């Protein structure tokens, strides 16, 4: 019986052993995955007795992303650009690979929600470690272009710097948006009584598509307010995380299993 | 779902339970949460967010003794508490189910108490622990012994009452018994208890509170005495798992599935 887990800390709010214990159910599978909270910087020596004891892969959460970047041996192109890794799997030769699979995530999430990225005008607000681990995959679904932006033009240039190898990719300041755009992206934090960042509404469009990376109960506030502009859909980063926890099952068995009937599951409990 | 975990500062049973949730068909998750501030604080608010019940490490055994409203007589005699349960009626059980796992593992390997000589090597946590549950299975007697005698002979007075218990220091120790049971630390730093291996006979079942890769250090000094079988931990530690989770659930999980996938990942 393969073990897995997810190191965190903290760990109260993770879904993952809830969610894959149902897609080893689903596809049958000889696992098991639990969450082990671990010490602010004991990372690196529980990880390391982990893969010791039968450990054949498993999720890194905050704030342990960064550390286990350098902890993998070899790194996905993905999570090379993304500066960060989720997913980690002990290889048969002995080796550890590390991956990040937030951007196909978003991607398998858009596609189930019937959104096409092929040649659309893709906005992505926001230039953290959110906007900078989805930019890759967005880019391998070959849309017209995707442009970043944040309120200062610098850190949304380095980004647009940095993947410019695989697409086109602009960068401006908030204050410079003055187009819409097909499928608008929202990677920004917003306040607990909805303040959203200074954007001109411009952006939005009859036949815009607008994913926010944030979920919760009926729609984020970044949605709400792309509808009062005319969003023609809009969908949340719920199924996101589903997708992404569903890439690293398929990473280490090999077999992408059904969100469908988990992310409703999931969404009655959120909703709950 | 039902929300369980294990309380420590650095485990086993999170995959151990899982593994119990799997075979009885149980609907919950079990977590090893980290213990910051202290265990009484993290323990409160995880039973305030609906948390069922949960084990604990050392050591916060003795806190956690203090924690429980009320106990089980096996707990307050151990003077420690391993697993916490919340009731109907918003109470928290504290319960100690590190003895009943070595009996229970004792007793699955065909190892007669009753009536038995039984010496008891060491007379800290994990030696009180298990007084009680091997004194309820009748024993002629059982030996406490520990390198500093006083704390051996302090222990058992306290539990002279429950059957026959006589203690003595190592050098005191010239003659062989039925069943040995090594509860001392003295294996972690490679060392051996100063004791005459007079104490081990063709017939004496050794009995080692700590497992691993092959045979454990005292086992394999048991085994240059012909001893007539060396068991290790291993199975205490299931067995008290299995018990704190028929404590939790009502059921009783089985144990030879789980005890022979955690053989196969310390065998490399
Ligand atoms: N395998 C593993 O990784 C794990 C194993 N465990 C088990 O849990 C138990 C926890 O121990 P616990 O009893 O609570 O610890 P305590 O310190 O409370 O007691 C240890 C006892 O062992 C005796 N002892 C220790 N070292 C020596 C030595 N070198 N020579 C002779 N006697 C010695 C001590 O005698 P004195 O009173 O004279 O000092 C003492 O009575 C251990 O026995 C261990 O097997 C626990 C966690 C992890």
């Known amino acids: 019986i393969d073990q897995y887990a997810v190191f965190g800390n903290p760990i109260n709010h993770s879904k993952s052993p809830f969610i894959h214990t149902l897609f080893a159910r689903q596809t049958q ?18 990880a390391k007795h982990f893969f010791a004891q039968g450990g054949r892969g498993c999720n890194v959460t905050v704030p342990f992303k960064e550390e286990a ?58 230039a953290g470690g959110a906007a900078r681990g989805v930019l890759k995959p967005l880019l391998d679904q070959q849309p017209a272009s995707i442009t970043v932006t944040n309120r200062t033009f610098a850190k949304a240039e380095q ?11 602009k960068a401006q300041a908030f204050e410079q948006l003055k187009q819409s755009y097909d499928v608008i992206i929202n990677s920004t934090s917003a306040s607990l009584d909805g303040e959203l960042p200074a954007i001109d509404p411009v952006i939005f469009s009859s036949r815009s598509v607008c994913y926010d990376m944030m979920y919760g109960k009926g729609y984020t506030v970044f949605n709400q307010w792309a509808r009062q502009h005319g969003c023609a859909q809009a969908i949340d980063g719920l199924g996101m995380l589903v997708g992404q926890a569903a890439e690293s099952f398929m ?17 009655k409990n959120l909703e709950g």
């Open 29 to 46: 599978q000889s696992m098991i995955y639990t969450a082990q909270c671990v010490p602010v910087d004991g990372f690196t020596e529980a």
């Open 69 to 126: 970047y350098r902890f993998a041996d070899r790194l996905t192109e993905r999570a090379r650009l993304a500066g960060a890794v989720n997913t980690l799997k002990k290889l048969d030769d002995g080796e550890i690979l590390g991956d990040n699979t937030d951007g196909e995530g978003l991607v398998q999430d858009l596609l189930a929600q019937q959104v096409l990225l092929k040649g659309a005008t893709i906005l992505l607000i926001g």
């Open 159 to 169: 980004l647009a710097e940095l993947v410019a190898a695989y697409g086109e990719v």
């Open 251 to 267: 990473l280490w068995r090999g077999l992408r299993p059904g969100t469908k009937q988990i992310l409703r599951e999931l969404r």
